[PDB]
Write an enzyme that holds these catalytic residues in place. Structure first.
Site: not given
Lengths: 249, 249
Positions: B10, B12, B94, B96, B166, B172, B212
């Site tokens: 990914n 991103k 996702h 985000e 996730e 991250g 991570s």
């Protein structure tokens, strides 16, 4: 006596490699005699095809949106990426984004400011809904939208900016917008700029009509004093766009 | 015993032409000896370059998002466009996108059902927040997430679906889940599937871990019964991605 007109095509979220390839062809064939800046906003996915294929000198490519910084933003596209990819124009604040994708006046303002910083030519979009218009809030909404943008810009920066007034009230509501109506919203925009920033900036400024334009009413629309061009939706996926370009003479 | 794993990059909202082509050169160079499906998820802007230069037979390309239908969605990319261009994989829901862009459980399910109907291979993202995990409501969050997606799906549809777990707190931060945490999370998801859908389905379902994951820790994570691979952000911009691939089997 106006500045350089702009004929921008917003293909929106449409198109196939095949169908757009042909469009591009028609476009490259068009005989355009006057000083007009032509723009094509493709989806992100089509930018590369569009870059290779637009050969026409009066045409540049533009994106339909972006976010200022690269990073952990799955599905989003940043300014630096578009810069590296060689896209120099961009459409920001489109009403559809303002409606479906949480685009506030402040979010928009940030985007413009970021773009101008990166050195992009920006087509920033403002306009009021029907509710707003019907409550007598046209002025207040519109001037607020431009003021939020203006807050983040130095005088100098205005050179990189284009305003596209979108009559949201007329778009998909059953209403008709007249050329006088258009001009009125337009005028008001210039007024505010003229006063707040300066007559010089004001005269150099491009105000685009971003409503229902077709090859028939585009010359009548261009006839108005403060109409510098068009931000086109529907007729942009069509041959008719050429007439639309021709109306800017 | 385990279905075929997935290792997905990914990317991103990151990259440059130069930098990505480098990653791609390495990728191509690498020898993958085991049965693993590698996925590369680039920005829309980069799908061209990626699809053109990515030669490795164990790799496919994936979009990072989309909307179901074409039309008047300035700035968006629809499945039909993606399909037309050659994309058959897509990462949906996702975190985000759930945080930043208004993506609800219903909005994800809706994109998932569509994408599956269009013939895509979908990586669906699910996960709890730091807040949610601390109040001990994880089990609730995940099952509701998974269940929203199930609602719109057919039993056969599960063949096109991949679940990525996730945990938002691991995204991250360096704060990777432990092999025990991942395993309990995954087993919980699997259990829901075998129960509600069928053991057949459950045994075949690939459930990926994300948050991570790096060259070092991947090995251990994979060692877990119900961990079928990874979905990798940051490390996927580096060469260590190569190790992560090799950490599966």
């Amino acid at each position: 006596s106006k500045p350089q007109p702009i004929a921008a095509a917003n293909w929106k979220c449409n198109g196939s490699q095949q169908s757009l390839s042909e469009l591009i062809d028609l476009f490259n064939s068009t005989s355009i005699n006057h000083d007009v800046q032509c723009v094509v906003a493709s989806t992100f996915v089509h930018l590369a095809m569009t870059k290779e294929r637009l050969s026409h000198p009066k045409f540049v490519i533009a994106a339909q949106n972006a976010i200022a910084k690269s990073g952990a933003f799955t599905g989003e596209v940043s300014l630096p990426i578009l810069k590296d990819f060689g896209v120099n124009w961009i459409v920001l604040g489109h009403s559809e984004r303002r409606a479906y994708y949480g685009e506030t006046n402040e979010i928009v303002a940030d985007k413009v400011a970021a773009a101008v910083a990166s050195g992009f030519m920006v087509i920033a979009c403002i306009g009021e809904t029907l509710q707003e218009r019907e409550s007598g809030r046209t002025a207040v909404v519109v001037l607020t939208q431009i003021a939020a943008i203006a807050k983040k810009l130095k005088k100098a920066d205005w050179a990189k900016v284009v305003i596209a007034y979108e009559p949201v009230w007329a778009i998909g509501t059953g209403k008709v917008a007249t050329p006088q109506q258009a001009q009125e919203a337009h005028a008001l925009i210039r007024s505010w700029v003229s006063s707040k920033i300066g007559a010089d900036v004001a005269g150099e400024l491009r105000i685009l009509y971003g409503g229902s334009v077709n090859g028939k009413n585009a010359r009548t629309l261009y006839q108005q004093r403060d109409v510098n061009g068009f931000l086109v939706g529907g007729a942009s996926l069509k041959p008719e766009f050429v007439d639309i370009i021709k109306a800017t003479q």
